Design a protein around this nucleic acid. Structure first.
Lengths: 223, 299, 244, 215, 251
RNA sequence: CCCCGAGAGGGGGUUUUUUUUUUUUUUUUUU
C-alpha cells in the first residue's frame, strides 16, 4: 500500500492529480462546474462527462467499461444537486498499465478511482464523503488473498477484485460500498474474507490520502 | 467551447510585441527549454516545454504487412486530443482544422519522411512483421503542440527497444527481454519541428499593399500568443542541413525572405535540440547499465 | 534512379517544356450561373477543376452563425476518376483532403473581406475532374477566380504554383511524372507581391536550394496572376460592351 | 479492428462450406413489443423459402428539424441474423415502402410529428438447397399491422402480392394501386401479374383484418 | 575539365587566413596546420601516387603523438561531377607489372593529391595520443595541410633506421613509429589477428631488354610492418568515428 | 444604437444534438 500521489499538476484544468500504485500510473483532470451541452443537461443535477484513455492504442469498448464503473463510484460521491443544469468533465489518462492489459484491467480501474477522487478534491467540487479503491486477487495454489497484487501475481490468479468504499467521520466509518467488481471463481466464504481484509486496507488508504491532500492543499490556503 | 479574449488583452499583447516584449519574458527568436524524461519501460518519454506537457508511448506487436508492401512493417502515429489539455478541445475531435493540421505535420515529419526504418520492421517477407505504434498524449496545453509532439515521437522511437524475435518456418518465437536483451529501432534521420507565429501590427491594407514590411514573427508561441496570431509556419529540419517539410497553410501573407530567415533560425534550434536528445539518451543508457551492474553485484 | 530524361542536356523536359514555362493555363468564368453565385472552370495542363461559390447566404443552422463575420467553408471533391488508376475508396473524409480544405480556408480568411458579410455563409464546393500534378496550385487559382465571379470582396489575387527540384535544377509547373521523381514546393503568392499565403513542402529539400526554388515559384505565380487577370478583364469587357 | 465492437482477431477468416403455382401460408401476431407504439410479427413458409420478419413503429414523436402541418414518415429495413442484403437494396425497398404508406397514412392528423417504422428482416432462410422481391409483400403486411396496432390512422388496409419478380400493392378492394415494382420477369406479362398479386393481396388483407380483430 | 584551372602549378595557400584564399575556400578556416610536423612517406621505389604519410613526436607528459596523414582527394573530386562519376565507375585502380590504370587523372593522383615531399599538400589527418604500450588515450580527426620531409623507399627507410648514423629529429621519430608498430601488432596477435600469406613473385625487367627475363620474390621488411600497423590504426579510428556520426550510411 | 406617434407613450436588435479508419506510378598493407 505504498502509493504515491501529486495534486494540482495541470494548468488549464480546474483540478488534476497523478496517482501511482506500483507500476500503474494514472493522471486525471477535472473541469467543472461549467456550461453543459444540450444533450448533457440535467434540469436538477450535475452532468458527468467521464473519459478514460488507455496507455496503448486508442479508446475501445474496454475503456467504455472503465468509464461506466468509474461513473458508478463518482456519481454518489458528488453532491450533484448543488450544480443544476451544469457540467463536470472528468478525464483519466492511464500512462502505465502496471498489468497485462490483454488480460486484466484491475489496477488501472482502482488507480483511476483514486485519481479521479483526488482530482475532484483539487477542483473544489462538493463531495458527500471520501473514497478509496484497492485491487485484490486470489491464487489457487496459495489460497491467499493478496491486496494490491503485482502483474506477475495476477497471471497466476483465480479471481480478481476491485473494491471501492465510501468513508465518513475522519475516514473511520464505511458509509457504503461504492463498487465491488468480482471476477473469476470464488465462494461465499472467500467473498467476506475478502471484504474484511479489503475494508482494512481501504481504511489505511483513506488515511494516507487524507495525509496527501492536506500536505498539498494547506500551503495554498491561509492561516 | 470558446476562449473569450477581451479587446484589452488583444491590444496589450500585440502592443508588447511592438515594444519587443513577450509575456513569458522570452526572446522573439527564443525557443522554450525542452525537458525530456524517460520512464522505466522503453518507449516511454515525457516532453515538457514550459507549461506544455506531452507524453509519448511507443509500442509494437506482431502483425502482417500489406499486400502492396511485403518487405515493409507497419507504423502509425496517434495524436488524439482530450479535454485534459483544456476544455477548448472536444473529446475525439479528429476532424477539426487545427487537429488535422497537427496530425498531418507530424505524419509528414516522421512517417512520410522515413525517419523510421520500416524495412527493418520485417521479420518474414509478406508474412509477419513488426507494427510500431506511437501514441502521443496531450496532457497540458500552453502552445507548441506540434514541436512538442515531434520531439516526443522521435525521442520515444530512439529510446524504444523491441524484443528479439527468431523465426522458423511459420512459427514465431518471441524472446522475453530477460532471457535476451531487446533490439533498438532503425532511425534514418532525426526530424525536429520549429513553429513560427506571425502578427500583423497594422491593418490588412498595409499587409497587402504596404511598402515596408512590419509583420512580427516569434518562435514557439505560448497559448496566449497562439490565440492572437495571424499566421502560422511549421518548418522541420535535421542535422544534415535539409528541410524535411515546410507548412504555411494560409494565414497572414508573409515575405519570402522572412520565411527563409525563419528556416535558417530554426536550423540553429534543431541542432541544439538534436544533440540534447542524444545526450539524454546516453545518460539514460549509462543509468540503466550502472543499475544493472549494481543489481548483478549484490545479487 | 530514373531511366527517363526528366531534364535532358538539351534543356528539354518529358512533355517538351523548358525549365521556366507555365502549362497551358486556360481559365473560364461564369460556367455555372444556375448552380452558384460564382463559378470557375480551371484547365491548367491536364488538370480539370470545377469551382462553385455559393453565397453569401443564410446559414442552414442558426447555431453556426457569426455576427461579426461570414462563415467560410471549402469542400474539395477529388473524384475517383481523377487519376489514371481509379481509386476504390472515397477521399471525402481522407485526412489529406481535410488538410487541403482547411489550408484553403486559412488562405482566404485573410483575403476575403468576411467582416463586411456578417450573419452569412460562403460555401465553396470544388470538383476535381482530372489530376496531373500541381493540383494544390490549381485549387488556389480556381477559388480566386470563382470568388471574384461571385462579386465577393477581397484584397488581392492569390495565385498558386508548384516548383520541383530535380537535382540542382528547378522545374516550374511540374506534372505527375515529375512530382513522382522529385521533391516539389507549392507556393501561394498574394497579388504581385513577394508575400506568401501558402508555403507547402512535403518532401526533402536541401536548405540551400529552398530560397532559389521560392524565387522561381514567385516569378511563375506572378505570370499565373497575369493570365487570370487578363482572362478576367476580357470577360468583363465583353459583358460591359454587351450590357452597356 | 473497430473500436466500438468486438470483431475478434484480424487474421481470422469466416467459415466457408463445401460439397462432399404453389400455395402460401403465413402467421400473424401484433403488439408484443412494449418498447414502441406498434409492432408486428409476420412469418411465411412456402416451397423452399421461409421468412420471419418483425416490424416496429415508433411515433408519433417530436420532430426537431422543421414545422409541419402534416406528419413525417421514415422506414428503415435492417438485415437479420444470417441472410444478408446489400444496403443499397434495403434502401431502395425502404423508398418504395415510403411511397406506399404516404398514400395510406392519414398524415393530416399528426402535425410536427414523426412516425419512424422499423422492419427487421430477422430470419430469412433460403432452402433451395434479386431475392428481395419476394419479401416486399410481407414487409407491407407487417408495416400495415404495426401501424394499425400503433393506432395510426390508415385510409385503407394496404396489402400486396408477388408474381414472377413483379410486386404490386393494392388498396380499395384491389381497385387502385399504391405501388408497382418489377425486376427481371418476362415480357407482356403485366395482366397476369396483376391478377395473381391481387389474389395474394386479398388473402393477406383478410388475414390481417382477422388478426387485428380477433387477437 | 573538373580538374583545377591552375594545373600542375597548383599550390596550397601560404597563409590559411588570406582574404583571397578564404574567399575561394571558405572551409579553409577549418583546415589545421601541420606543416611544422615531420612527415615522411614510406612507399615502393617507383611510387609516384602517395596516399599515406606518417610522423611521431614525444609529448611532454610521457605519451606519444602519432599522426597518420591521408591524401585529401575529397577536396578535388566533388559528387555529381563527371570526375566523381568515372571515379565511382572504376571503383579502384588496377596494378600490373606492365602498366597502371589509374582511377583518377594523372594530374590529380600523381601530383595535386599525392603527398609528395618538399611541397605543401592538403591532407586528412588522424592524430592519436597513446602511451608507451600503444594504448589509445584519445583520437582526433582533422583536415590539415602538411609538407612531407622525405619520400622514403621500404629499403631506404629500413637502412636509415639500421645504420644508427643519424640522430636527426626525423629519424628519431621514424624509430619511434617502428617501436609502436611492434607493440600494436603484438596486441592484435594477442587479440586474435590472423597471419595469412601469399607473397606473389615480382617480374624483374632487364634495363637492357624490354622482354622479361628474371623472376624474383618481394621480401617483407620491418618497414612494411611499420606502415601496415599505422594504416590499420588509422582505418579503425576513422571507422569508429564515421559510424558514430552516421550510424546508418557509414562506408 | 433602430422603427411608428410631434412633445417624456408604444414596437423590435436575432442561443442549443444525429452516422469509424487506408490514400498516387581467396585475408591484410603499400603500390
Amino acid at each position: 500500500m505504498s502509493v504515491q500521489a501529486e495534486i494540482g499538476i495541470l494548468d488549464h484544468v480546474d483540478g488534476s492529480s497523478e496517482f501511482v500504485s506500483q507500476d500503474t500510473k494514472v493522471i486525471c483532470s477535472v473541469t467543472g462546474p461549467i456550461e453543459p451541452k444540450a444533450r448533457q443537461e440535467l434540469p436538477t443535477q450535475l452532468a458527468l462527462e467521464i473519459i478514460v484513455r488507455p496507455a496503448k492504442g486508442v479508446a475501445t469498448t474496454r475503456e467504455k467499461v472503465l468509464e461506466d464503473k468509474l461513473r458508478a463510484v463518482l456519481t454518489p460521491l458528488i453532491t450533484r444537486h448543488c450544480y443544476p443544469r451544469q457540467l463536470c468533465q472528468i478525464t483519466c489518462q492511464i500512462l502505465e498499465s502496471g498489468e497485462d492489459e490483454a488480460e486484466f484491467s484491475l489496477r488501472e480501474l482502482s488507480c483511476c478511482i483514486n485519481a479521479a477522487f483526488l482530482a475532484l478534491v483539487d477542483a473544489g467540487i462538493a463531495l458527500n464523503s471520501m473514497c478509496a479503491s484497492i485491487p485484490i486477487a486470489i491464487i489457487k495454489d496459495t489460497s491467499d488473498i493478496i491486496v494490491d497484487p503485482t502483474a506477475e501475481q495476477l497471471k497466476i490468479s483465480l479471481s480478481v477484485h476491485t473494491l471501492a468504499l465510501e468513508f465518513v467521520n475522519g475516514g473511520k466509518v464505511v458509509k457504503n460500498v461504492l463498487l465491488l467488481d468480482s471476477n473469476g471463481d470464488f465462494n461465499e466464504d472467500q467473498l467476506f474474507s475478502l471484504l474484511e481484509l479489503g475494508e482494512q486496507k481501504c481504511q489505511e488508504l483513506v488515511t494516507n490520502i487524507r495525509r496527501i491532500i492536506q500536505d498539498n492543499i494547506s500551503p495554498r490556503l491561509v492561516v | 467551447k470558446d476562449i473569450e479574449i477581451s479587446a484589452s488583452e488583444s491590444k496589450f499583447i500585440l502592443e508588447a510585441l511592438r515594444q519587443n516584449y513577450r509575456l513569458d519574458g522570452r526572446s522573439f527568436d527564443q525557443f522554450r527549454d525542452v525537458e525530456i524524461t524517460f520512464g522505466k519501460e522503453f518507449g516511454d518519454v515525457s516532453v515538457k516545454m514550459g507549461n506544455t506537457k506531452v507524453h509519448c508511448r511507443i509500442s509494437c506487436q506482431i502483425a502482417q504487412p500489406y499486400e502492396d508492401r511485403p518487405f515493409e512493417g507497419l507504423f502509425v502515429i496517434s495524436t488524439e486530443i482530450s479535454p485534459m489539455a483544456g476544455s477548448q478541445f472536444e473529446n475525439g475531435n479528429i476532424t477539426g482544422e487545427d487537429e488535422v493540421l497537427c496530425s498531418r505535420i507530424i505524419e509528414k515529419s516522421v512517417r512520410r519522411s522515413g525517419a523510421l526504418d520500416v524495412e527493418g520492421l520485417c521479420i518474414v517477407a509478406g508474412s509477419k512483421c513488426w507494427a510500431v505504434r506511437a501514441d502521443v498524449h496531450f496532457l497540458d496545453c500552453d502552445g507548441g503542440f506540434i514541436d512538442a509532439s515531434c520531439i516526443a515521437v522521435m525521442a520515444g522511437l530512439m529510446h524504444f527497444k523491441k524484443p528479439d524475435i527468431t523465426v522458423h518456418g511459420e512459427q514465431i518465437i518471441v524472446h522475453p527481454v530477460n532471457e535476451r536483451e531487446p533490439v533498438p529501432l532503425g532511425i534514418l534521420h532525426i526530424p525536429i519541428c520549429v513553429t513560427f507565429s506571425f502578427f500583423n501590427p497594422q491593418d490588412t491594407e498595409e499587409n497587402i499593399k504596404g511598402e515596408t514590411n512590419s509583420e512580427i514573427s516569434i518562435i514557439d508561441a505560448t497559448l496566449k500568443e497562439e490565440l492572437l496570431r495571424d499566421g502560422v509556419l511549421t518548418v522541420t529540419l535535421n542535422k544534415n542541413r535539409e528541410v524535411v517539410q515546410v507548412s504555411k497553410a494560409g494565414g497572414l501573407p508573409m515575405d519570402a525572405l522572412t520565411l527563409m530567415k525563419c528556416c535558417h533560425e530554426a536550423y540553429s534550434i534543431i541542432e541544439k535540440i538534436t544533440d540534447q536528445i542524444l545526450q539524454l539518451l546516453k545518460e539514460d543508457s549509462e543509468k540503466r547499465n550502472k543499475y544493472a551492474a549494481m543489481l548483478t553485484s549484490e545479487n | 534512379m530514373s531511366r527517363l530524361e526528366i531534364y535532358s542536356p538539351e534543356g528539354l523536359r518529358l512533355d517538351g517544356r523548358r525549365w521556366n514555362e507555365l502549362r497551358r493555363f486556360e481559365s473560364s468564368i461564369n460556367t455555372h450561373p444556375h448552380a452558384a453565385d460564382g463559378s470557375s472552370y480551371m484547365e491548367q495542363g491536364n488538370n480539370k477543376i470545377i469551382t462553385l461559390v455559393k453565397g453569401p447566404k443564410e446559414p442552414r443552422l442558426k447555431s453556426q452563425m457569426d455576427t461579426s463575420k461570414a462563415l467560410l467553408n471549402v469542400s474539395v471533391n477529388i473524384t475517383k476518376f481523377s487519376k489514371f488508376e481509379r481509386s476504390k475508396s472515397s477521399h471525402k473524409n481522407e485526412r489529406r483532403v481535410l488538410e487541403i480544405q482547411t489550408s484553403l480556408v486559412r488562405m482566404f480568411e485573410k483575403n476575403v473581406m468576411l467582416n463586411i458579410y456578417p450573419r452569412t455563409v460562403i460555401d465553396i464546393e470544388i470538383h476535381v475532374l482530372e489530376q496531373d500534378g500541381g493540383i494544390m496550385g490549381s485549387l488556389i487559382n480556381g477559388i480566386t477566380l470563382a470568388l471574384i465571379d461571385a462579386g465577393i470582396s477581397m484584397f488581392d489575387y492569390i495565385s498558386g504554383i508548384s516548383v520541383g527540384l530535380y537535382d540542382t535544377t528547378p522545374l516550374l509547373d511540374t506534372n505527375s511524372l515529375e512530382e513522382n521523381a522529385m521533391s516539389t514546393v507549392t507556393l501561394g503568392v498574394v497579388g504581385k507581391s513577394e508575400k506568401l499565403s501558402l508555403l507547402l513542402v512535403e518532401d526533402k529539400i536541401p536548405l540551400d536550394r529552398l530560397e532559389n526554388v521560392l524565387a522561381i515559384g514567385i516569378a511563375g505565380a506572378h505570370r499565373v496572376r497575369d493570365l487570370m487577370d487578363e482572362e478576367l478583364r476580357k470577360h468583363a469587357q465583353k459583358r460591359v460592351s454587351n450590357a452597356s | 479492428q473497430d473500436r466500438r465492437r468486438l470483431l475478434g482477431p484480424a487474421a481470422a477468416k469466416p467459415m466457408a462450406f463445401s460439397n462432399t403455382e404453389s400455395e402460401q401460408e403465413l402467421s400473424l401476431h401484433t403488439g408484443f413489443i412494449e418498447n414502441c407504439n406498434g409492432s408486428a410479427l409476420v412469418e411465411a413458409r412456402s416451397l423452399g423459402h421461409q421468412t420471419s420478419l418483425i416490424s416496429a413503429v415508433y411515433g408519433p414523436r417530436s420532430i426537431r428539424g422543421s414545422f409541419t402541418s402534416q406528419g413525417t414518415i421514415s422506414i428503415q429495413l435492417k438485415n437479420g441474423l444470417l441472410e444478408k442484403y446489400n444496403t443499397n437494396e434495403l434502401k431502395e425497398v425502404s423508398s418504395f415502402l415510403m411511397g406506399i404508406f404516404n398514400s395510406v397514412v392519414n398524415l393530416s392528423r399528426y402535425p410536427k410529428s414523426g412516425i419512424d417504422i422499423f422492419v427487421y428482416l430477422t430470419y430469412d432462410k433460403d432452402l433451395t438447397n434479386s431475392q428481395i422481391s419476394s419479401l416486399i409483400p410481407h414487409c407491407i403486411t407487417s408495416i400495415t399491422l404495426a401501424l394499425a396496432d400503433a393506432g395510426i390512422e390508415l385510409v385503407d388496409m394496404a396489402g400486396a402480392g408477388e408474381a414472377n419478380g413483379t410486386v404490386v400493392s393494392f388498396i380499395k378492394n384491389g381497385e387502385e394501386i399504391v405501388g408497382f415494382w418489377k425486376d427481371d420477369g418476362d415480357d407482356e406479362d403485366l395482366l397476369e401479374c396483376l391478377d395473381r398479386c391481387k389474389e395474394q393481396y386479398n388473402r393477406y388483407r383478410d388475414l390481417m383484418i382477422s388478426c387485428l380483430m380477433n387477437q | 575539365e573538373c580538374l583545377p584551372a591552375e594545373g600542375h602549378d597548383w599550390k596550397a595557400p601560404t597563409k590559411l587566413d588570406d582574404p583571397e584564399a578564404v574567399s575561394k575556400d571558405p572551409l579553409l578556416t577549418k583546415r589545421k596546420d601541420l606543416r611544422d610536423k615531420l612527415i615522411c612517406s614510406i612507399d615502393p621505389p617507383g611510387c609516384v601516387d602517395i596516399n599515406d604519410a606518417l610522423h611521431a613526436k614525444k609529448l611532454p607528459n610521457g605519451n606519444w603523438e602519432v599522426g597518420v596523414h591521408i591524401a585529401d582527394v575529397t577536396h578535388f573530386v566533388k559528387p555529381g561531377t563527371a570526375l566523381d562519376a568515372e571515379g565511382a565507375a572504376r571503383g579502384t585502380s588496377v596494378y600490373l607489372v606492365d602498366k597502371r590504370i589509374d582511377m583518377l587523372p594523372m594530374l590529380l593522383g600523381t601530383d595535386l593529391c599525392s603527398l609528395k615531399p618538399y611541397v605543401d599538400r592538403f591532407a586528412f589527418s588522424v592524430i592519436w595520443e597513446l602511451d608507451d604500450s600503444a594504448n589509445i588515450v584519445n583520437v582526433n580527426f582533422m583536415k590539415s595541410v602538411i609538407r612531407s620531409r622525405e619520400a622514403f623507399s621500404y629499403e631506404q627507410a629500413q637502412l636509415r633506421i639500421d645504420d644508427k648514423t643519424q640522430n636527426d629529429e626525423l629519424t628519431m621519430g621514424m624509430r619511434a613509429l617502428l617501436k609502436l608498430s611492434v607493440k600494436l601488432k603484438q596486441k592484435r596477435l594477442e587479440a586474435g589477428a590472423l597471419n595469412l600469406a601469399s607473397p606473389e613473385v615480382k617480374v624483374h625487367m632487364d634495363s637492357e631488354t624490354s622482354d622479361p627475363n628474371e623472376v624474383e620474390i618481394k621480401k617483407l621488411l620491418a618497414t612494411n610492418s611499420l606502415v601496415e600497423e599505422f594504416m590499420l590504426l588509422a582505418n579503425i579510428s576513422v571507422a569508429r568515428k564515421i559510424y558514430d556520426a552516421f550510424p546508418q550510411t557509414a562506408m
